Design a protein around this ligand. Structure first.
Ligand SMILES: CCCCCCCCCCCCCCCCCC(=O)OC[C@H](COP(=O)(O)OCCN)OC(=O)CCCCCCCCCCCCCCCCC
Ligand SMILES: CCCCCCCCCCCCCCCCCC(=O)OC[C@H](COP(=O)(O)OCCN)OC(=O)CCCCCCCCCCCCCCCCC
Ligand SMILES: CCCCCCCCCCCCCCCCCC(=O)OC[C@H](COP(=O)(O)OCCN)OC(=O)CCCCCCCCCCCCCCCCC
Ligand SMILES: CCCCCCCCCCCCCCCCCC(=O)OC[C@H](COP(=O)(O)OCCN)OC(=O)CCCCCCCCCCCCCCCCC
Ligand SMILES: CCCCCCCCCCCCCCCCCCCC
Ligand SMILES: CCCCCCCCCCCCCCCCCCCC
Ligand SMILES: CCCCCCCCCCCCCCCCCCCC
Lengths: 55, 478, 111, 504
């Protein structure tokens, strides 16, 4: 039952999580300029809303 | 306030680089000579670099209602001038293969260096804005210098559109800040508020809009999506300049603005910047895990390193070595990016036409280019925070600064991002030594520049005391 | 031939160490050497895997016994502070005048 | 005085092996042998001139030698070396294993042997610097400096039979584990330095000055937790252990690189030297967790090693179990258990060195490492199976070898402190005997189940036999007469134990 080293897989789980998160985050780099401007405006909205909430 | 002869001798690098621009333009108008124009450009930049010593003799003072010269300006002017000199040195062998006109490159590099020096000396909203655009527009020219190539034209279009949008955002933010305050000086942004009403909504919204613009200019999440495409499409010396000089000058003026403005002490801005730095570190490290292109990988590297810089920036009002940490980190990051992008440029030089690919193919670089592979792996280990490197000294400074201010979330972000950066940097450094299947002194000069950068990183990683003493000697005005 | 005679000579030497030792640790040295020589001599015809399995079972059962002997050694040293037999029979009734549970455990693991 | 030379002589030697490759490919091995012989001679001269046997415990700090040089005066950082009995013992062990590693790769006539030898000597210099530094930044510096040559050796000069992608994957996993743990240790170091700075006002990184640091309960726990994460990754302690079999599998074929950096107990030395004296109360509260982690590590390594079809992975999990024994020993707070831990660490290094060298020689003979491909090898090899039988006997805790003295003094001290962990660890010793017998009977005994194990194999060379018999002699002498090693480290163990039990 232990020949496959389960604790090694348990500690290798964050590497799989990091790979999956990087693959998911790379979808935002689609190369579309209109999406880049939309993301810039989204970030402006998020920053201004955070500053208004935390004021 | 008028200009004195002391104010004129404190204006020496700006005047020298501007006179170099005029002289280079008159030389181009006389006769198109690539060697003579490049020589005039590098002589003017070196003259500014050595006139920095006379500026240091002149002392620290306020030269304009706009500019202020102190050791802060000395250090960041020197970093910008070194980046511009390295950019010209890498640019000549790349421009040797250019069929179209080559002399405009050094004119644009000189004007962008002038904008960087202005940003280093900036003590005003007007000077900050003018330095940002004086950096941006020559970068618009240099990114799309090879406009026949599809990648460079696309990167130029993306950079121009997004930087125009960010300049509009930044100018609207300055307009709201000026409507709130009534003075455009850096020290006066919040002096009309007291007894605990520093969090004025109009001032906070204006500062948030300039935060949006500068976070575009510093590749901070979520204004970071342009970085790999613009880094990949632009020419490799342009990638070198955009990675080093623009980021250094904009972060220096952001340092000076957040140090001098009383509203930089406000907690909402600090929490927003903490979220931005956390997300920037995590995203810029995670998004470079599976990159087969060195330019996009170095762009995500720039995002993560600017996240580390912002982490050092957050504790500016609490710690005492935070701006010293920023200076040491920026010197190390300058040398690291200079070496890495210089190796990339020396492999990409000369320009082999616009229809042919500029593919790096870093696998097995040691078996034909051993010295450049050694330099490249040294800079790869330097960017990872691995010891006996200057990047490790900067990372240690960032970690100590974060430890002082109890910013433990940011410290955990630095640790996790350092692990992910370790993975991809070591992947590149070990792919250098696997198995895969010049002839002029300008190329030798570029190789000498990257070798000197690698040796400087190794020496100042083993013995970091002279750089720490130099950065501590660059004491701004309180 | 030489391997057999070397193993039997080491067996003789370890048993002499076992029967001549004045302290429990030296007698444990002879004890475990005797067990090792028993393992090396039982599986002498190493070509047959059944001999190897027999040597495995012998050494594992004797090693469980030696672990119980080690239990007794630990208890005796923790109680009396010595491992000499004469020192046990000298200062055992003085130390165990009040309680006899640890001495009972030590004798049980000796058994 | 001799400590800066003790660190710099491997570095200058490795630079000389790189530079003197132009005079010949057979030259850098001789240069590396000469400079490791010089390092071992300097270590033995320090042993002779130290007078460690007559030294009595006086309390931390107490160093037999001390060197100071300012390195970064802004942070109060010094190149600060200090040697006492324990550090000298580890330096002597490092020098001996470095000589053995240099001799173990004597037949490599590769075109880039000089950089391999530089890489090895820089690993050895980093290990010596870890054992010698008593400055927090310098200790961390050497701790993370000895990993880049480790990574490059595993990745480039590793196991040629396996694919390159697996070698790079194992090397990157090892580097990521060790350097992330080192970063957490650096954060603990920096927070301790800043706590001392707020309490005092003096910038320092010295171990002697940071000892008397007044900290609240909970901060000290976090600092010792960071130190323990580093010293538990490089021990290894479960579950932070997979890098060790992954790197041992993809280690270079000769096995020298296994002996150079992976086989030396820097983490347990750091636990004895830095974790316990700096954070005594927090380590006293963390003792049950660390002791149960050691028990779980012993049995996890035993069950792992029994189920391994690879010899190198079997020895790696043997190392995991014995390091769990040492981890149980360290958190007892007993002088006898600490001395047993020192003896066990030295003997385990010697036994694992012999096992890895014999496995490398066996792979040179037969070109395989799977237990389903060997059997009955006793009748085909002249010297190797009997020596491997001796070393597998050593790693099961057999009296007559120093490992027995190690675990038995460990368990005597532990039963003086905690009895249940002692009895469960003795059952772990039974498990150790079980997997040693399993390896012996799957490897060298039985009938051959492959064609490459059906032919007569060449005997071992004179140098390999000489160095393996030297290891045999040292293990036997440590088993029968461990007294000089015990009197060498009596003062340092006494100081650490008195500081641990007098500050709780
Ligand atoms: C993934 C790896 C990275 C993980 C994330 C990075 C590290 C996270 C550390 C979290 C620490 C949480 C602390 C919560 C309480 C903070 C407030 C507080 O109590 O401050 C006390 C003190 C400041 O007040 P002062 O007047 O100095 O009092 C002296 C008290 N000794 O405070 C001080 O003087 C400074 C206290 C510093 C405490 C130690 C911080 C580092 C500890 C080592 C690393 C974390 C633990 C080990 C790894 C865990 C698993 C990752
Ligand atoms: C009753 C009261 C007293 C109890 C005292 C304690 C228990 C004593 C147990 C005595 C009996 C042990 C029998 C061991 C037999 C070993 C030989 C054997 O079965 O060998 C077969 C196999 C061979 O291995 P392999 O290399 O795969 O073979 C090659 C191909 N033939 O090898 C194997 O399969 C390996 C077998 C390993 C056995 C390990 C035994 C460990 C015992 C631990 C005792 C723990 C006691 C406490 C338990 C918890 C109580 C709450
Ligand atoms: C006691 C626990 C609390 C304290 C923890 C302190 C930290 C140190 C100890 C834990 C370290 C865990 C490291 C786990 C990953 C090890 C690296 C690894 O396995 O890399 C190899 C792997 C690529 O190999 P492969 O499987 O071939 O990938 C297929 C894709 N081509 O690579 C990959 O898949 C990508 C690797 C990305 C970089 C490594 C992952 C970094 C994640 C954050 C690390 C910081 C710790 C966070 C908490 C860990 C869990 C508690
Ligand atoms: C991308 C996703 C994947 C990668 C990322 C994964 C996650 C990475 C981050 C993991 C770490 C999270 C944060 C851990 C530190 C938490 C600190 C904390 O909670 O501190 C609270 C308290 C502070 O002490 P305080 O009471 O303020 O002291 C002043 C007066 N006494 O603290 C205390 O009082 C002491 C608390 C001690 C216990 C908390 C620390 C647990 C550490 C777990 C790892 C190590 C476990 C032990 C060893 C395991 C085997 C090696
Ligand atoms: C730790 C900071 C950096 C130190 C230097 C790291 C190495 C730099 C490059 C030196 C030259 C490397 C040559 C490697 C040759 C490998 C040949 C392999 C043949 C199979
Ligand atoms: C992915 C990175 C995760 C970092 C986690 C860091 C947690 C720090 C917790 C600090 C708590 C302070 C309480 C006061
Ligand atoms: C750190 C390396 C340790 C290697 C093993 C050393 C084991 C100890 C050997 C000591 C010598 C024993 C034989 C000679 C005894 C001489 C006694 C002289 C004084 C009475």
């Amino acid at each position: 039952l232990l020949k496959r080293d389960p604790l090694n897989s348990m500690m290798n789980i964050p590497a799989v999580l990091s790979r999956f998160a990087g693959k998911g985050l790379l979808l935002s780099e689609n190369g579309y300029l209109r999406w880049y401007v939309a993301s810039m405006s989204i970030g402006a909205v998020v920053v201004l809303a955070l500053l208004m909430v935390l004021r | 306030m008028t200009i004195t002869p002391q104010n004129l001798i404190a204006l020496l690098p700006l005047l020298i680089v501007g006179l170099t621009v005029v002289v280079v333009m008159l030389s181009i108008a006389w006769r198109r000579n690539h060697f003579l124009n490049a020589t005039l450009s590098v002589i003017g930049l070196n003259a500014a670099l050595v006139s920095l010593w006379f500026v240091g003799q002149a002392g620290a003072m306020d030269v304009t209602p706009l500019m202020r010269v102190d050791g802060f300006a000395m250090l960041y002017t020197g970093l910008v001038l070194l980046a511009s000199l390295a950019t010209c040195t890498f640019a000549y062998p790349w421009l040797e293969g250019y069929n179209d006109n080559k002399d405009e490159f050094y004119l644009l590099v000189l004007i962008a260096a002038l904008g960087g020096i202005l940003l280093a000396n900036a003590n005003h909203l007007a000077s900050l804005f003018l330095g940002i655009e004086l950096i941006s527009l020559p970068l618009f020219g240099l990114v799309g210098y090879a406009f026949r190539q599809k990648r460079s034209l696309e990167a130029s279009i993306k950079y121009t559109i997004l930087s125009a949008a960010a300049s509009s955002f930044l100018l609207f933010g300055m307009a709201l800040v000026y409507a709130q305050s009534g003075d455009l000086s850096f020290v006066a942004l919040g002096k009309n508020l007291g007894d605990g009403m520093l969090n004025e909504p109009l001032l906070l919204a204006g500062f948030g809009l300039m935060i949006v613009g500068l976070g575009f200019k510093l590749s901070l999440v979520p204004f970071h999506l342009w970085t790999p495409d613009v880094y990949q499409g632009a020419p490799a010396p342009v990638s070198t300049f955009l990675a080093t000089a623009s980021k250094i000058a904009i972060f220096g003026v952001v340092m000076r603005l957040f140090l001098y403005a009383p509203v930089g002490d406000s907690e909402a801005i600090r929490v927003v910047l903490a979220i931005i730095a956390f997300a920037s570190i995590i995203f810029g490290n995670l998004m470079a895990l599976s990159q087969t292109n060195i330019k996009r990988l170095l762009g995500y590297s720039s995002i993560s390193h600017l996240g580390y810089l912002l982490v050092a920036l957050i504790a500016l009002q609490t710690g005492e070595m935070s701006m010293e940490a920023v200076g040491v980190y920026l010197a190390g990051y300058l040398f690291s990016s200079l070496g890495a992008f210089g190796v990339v440029s020396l492999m990409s030089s000369p320009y082999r036409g616009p229809d042919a690919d500029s593919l790096f193919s870093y696998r097995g670089l040691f078996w034909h280019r051993p010295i450049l592979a050694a330099v490249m792996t040294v800079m790869m280990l330097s960017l990872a925070g691995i010891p006996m490197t200057l990047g490790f000294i900067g990372k240690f400074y960032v970690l100590a600064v974060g430890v002082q201010a109890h910013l433990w979330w940011l410290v955990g972000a630095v640790v996790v991002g350092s692990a992910i950066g370790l993975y991809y940097y070591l992947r590149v450094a070990v792919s250098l030594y696997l198995h895969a299947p010049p002839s002029n002194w300008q190329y030798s000069a570029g190789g000498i520049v990257v070798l000197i950068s690698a040796l400087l990183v190794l020496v100042l990683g083993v013995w970091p005391q002279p750089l720490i003493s130099i950065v501590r000697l660059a004491m701004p005005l309180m | 031939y030489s391997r057999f005679f070397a193993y039997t000579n080491l067996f003789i030497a370890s048993m002499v160490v076992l029967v001549l030792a004045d302290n429990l640790l030296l007698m444990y040295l002879g004890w475990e050497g005797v067990g090792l020589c028993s393992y090396l001599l039982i599986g002498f015809y190493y070509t047959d895997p059944k001999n190897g399995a027999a040597a495995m079972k012998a050494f594992v059962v004797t090693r469980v016994g030696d672990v119980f002997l080690a239990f007794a050694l630990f208890i005796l040293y923790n109680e009396l502070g010595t491992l000499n037999f004469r020192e046990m029979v000298e200062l055992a009734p003085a130390h165990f005048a009040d309680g006899n549970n640890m001495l009972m455990w030590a004798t049980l693991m000796l058994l | 005085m001799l400590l800066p030379w003790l660190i710099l002589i491997p570095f200058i030697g490795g630079f000389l092996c790189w530079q003197t490759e132009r005079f010949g490919v057979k030259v850098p091995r001789w240069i590396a042998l000469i400079t490791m012989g010089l390092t071992l001679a300097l270590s033995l001269q320090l042993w002779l001139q130290g007078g460690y046997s007559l030294t009595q415990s006086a309390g931390i700090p107490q160093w037999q030698s001390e060197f100071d040089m300012p390195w970064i005066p802004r942070f109060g950082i010094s190149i600060h070396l200090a040697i006492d009995g324990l550090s000298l013992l580890m330096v002597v062990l490092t020098g001996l294993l470095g000589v053995l590693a240099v001799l173990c790769s004597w037949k490599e006539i590769e075109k880039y042997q000089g950089f391999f030898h530089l890489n090895l000597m820089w690993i050895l210099g980093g290990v010596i610097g870890v054992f010698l530094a008593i400055d927090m930044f310098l200790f961390f510096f050497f701790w993370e400096m000895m990993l880049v040559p480790m990574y490059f050796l595993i990745a480039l000069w590793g196991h040629k039979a396996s694919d390159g992608k697996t070698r790079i994957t194992a090397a990157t996993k090892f580097f990521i584990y060790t350097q992330a743990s080192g970063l957490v240790m650096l954060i603990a170091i920096l927070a301790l330095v800043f706590v001392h700075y707020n309490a005092t006002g003096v910038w320092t990184f010295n171990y002697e000055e940071l000892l008397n640091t007044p900290m609240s309960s909970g901060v000290e726990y976090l600092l010792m937790l960071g130190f323990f994460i580093a010293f538990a990754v490089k021990m290894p302690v479960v579950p932070l252990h997979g890098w060790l079999p992954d790197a041992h599998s993809q280690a270079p074929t000769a096995g020298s690189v296994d002996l150079a950096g992976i086989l030396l107990k820097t983490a347990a030395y750091g636990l004895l030297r830095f974790s316990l004296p700096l954070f005594p109360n927090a380590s006293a509260e963390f003792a049950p967790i660390a002791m149960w982690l050691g028990v779980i590590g012993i049995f996890y390594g035993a069950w792992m090693a029994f189920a391994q079809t690879d010899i190198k992975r079997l020895i790696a999990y043997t190392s995991v179990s014995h390091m769990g024994f040492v981890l149980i020993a360290i958190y007892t707070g007993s002088q006898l258990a600490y001395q047993g831990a020192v003896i066990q660490m030295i003997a385990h290094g010697l036994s694992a060195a012999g096992l890895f060298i014999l496995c490398g020689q066996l792979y040179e003979r037969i070109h395989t490492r799977d237990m389903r491909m060997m059997g009955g090898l006793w009748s085909k090899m002249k010297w190797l199976p009997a020596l491997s039988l001796f070393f597998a006997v050593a790693t099961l805790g057999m009296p007559g070898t120093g490992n027995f003295v190690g675990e038995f003094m460990i368990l005597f001290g532990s039963f003086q402190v905690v009895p249940v962990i002692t009895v469960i660890s003795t059952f772990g010793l039974v498990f150790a005997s079980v997997y040693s017998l399993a390896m012996l009977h799957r490897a060298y005994f039985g009938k051959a189940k492959s064609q490459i194990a059906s032919q007569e194999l060449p005997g071992m060379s004179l140098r390999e036999l000489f160095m393996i018999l030297l290891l045999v002699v040292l293990l036997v002498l440590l088993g029968f007469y461990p007294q000089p090693i015990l009197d060498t480290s009596h003062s340092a163990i006494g100081n650490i134990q008195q500081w641990f039990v007098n500050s709780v």
